[model samples]
Target: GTKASKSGVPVTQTQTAGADTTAEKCKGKGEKDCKSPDCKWEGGTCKD
Candidate 1:
């Protein structure tokens, strides 16, 4: 689930897979580079 910003910009998020899904989710949130709040399951233990 990619989250695009109001400007339709894609965000990059750090995750375990580093797949499009992770990028999409972050992008969908309108973030340039963001990590999921619940990325623990995705192997992301820390938050930025």
Candidate 2:
């Protein structure tokens, strides 16, 4: 199965043309969460 996230960190490969969702999962996240791998803190907004 293909997994999805903000900034993709793929784990296993099955070749399916590539798929992802730019979901706003990082929007409300603060520096604390943004600093994590899924998002990045920039311009006062958490972004993928």
Candidate 3:
């Protein structure tokens, strides 16, 4: 499923959505913790 932001902006795919667990870099707390160096806090809770 394609997740959209509150503004109706496409966030990511449901299959590979949520915080990026690649452990590649530091993606601060956020709903969809992406791999980008600029991951922004979305809506969900950030896990350790």
Candidate 4:
């Protein structure tokens, strides 16, 4: 139940929730991102 930007060399958050759950990954880098749908990487930050 852990609900988890985009700077630093054209990052990628390609791991979509495809089983037993409904959620989307945040795109922020630095290893900190919001893992919820409607989440997005904006200006090196997770905008959820």
Candidate 5:
């Protein structure tokens, strides 16, 4: 059997997705990092 918290511990809270999703994660990635799949570096900028 599992033990319960006598002091009534609070559950961890989490935030929902928002601007972080709409914005490109690789927007400022460097050439070496832009090589990641689904991302390309050209015109001196990184884009998906």
Candidate 6:
């Protein structure tokens, strides 16, 4: 399943795969909720 973020947020799969990636895309018609430069990626989660 090639899933993306429909919630506008980008789920980074590099270090920490933030969020559930249950959204749908990077950004488009099916995208809506999203960015954080100071966001923390730890324990496979995002915290700010």
Give the TM-scores of the predictions, in the order they appear. 0.17, 0.44, 0.16, 0.23, 0.43, 0.23
Q: What does the lDDT come to for candidate 2?
A: 0.68
lDDT tens per residue, model 4, 1-48:
343344556555665555324323443433354533455555666653
Candidate with top lDDT is: 2
User: What digit string (tens of lDDT, one per residue) describes model 2 on residues 1-48?
Assistant: 444554466555674344245538888888777765676678889976
**CA deviation > 4 Å runs, candidate 2:** 1-19
lDDT, residue 20, candidate 4: 29
lDDT of candidate 5 over 1-48, digit per residue (tens): 357745366654665343354348778988887865656677888875
Q: What's the true lDDT of residue 26 in model 5?
A: 72
Model 5 misplaced regions, further than 4 Å: 1-23
Instruction: Arrange candidates, best lDDT first.
Output: 2, 5, 4, 3, 6, 1
lDDT of each: 0.40, 0.68, 0.45, 0.47, 0.67, 0.42
Error of 4 at 42 (Å): 0.6
Worst 10 residues of 1 by lDDT: 39-48
Candidate 5: count of backbone clashes, pairs at least 3 residues apart or interchain: 0
Cα lDDT, model 6, residue 45: 49
Q: Model 5: how far is 17 from its true place, Å? A: 17
Scored against the true structure, residue 5 in model 3 reaches a CA lDDT of: 38
**Span of ten consecutive residues with least summed lDDT in model 3:** 39-48
Candidate 1 vs 6: which has more TM-score: 6
lDDT of 1 by residue, 1-48 (tens): 455435455455655564445433443333324445633222333332
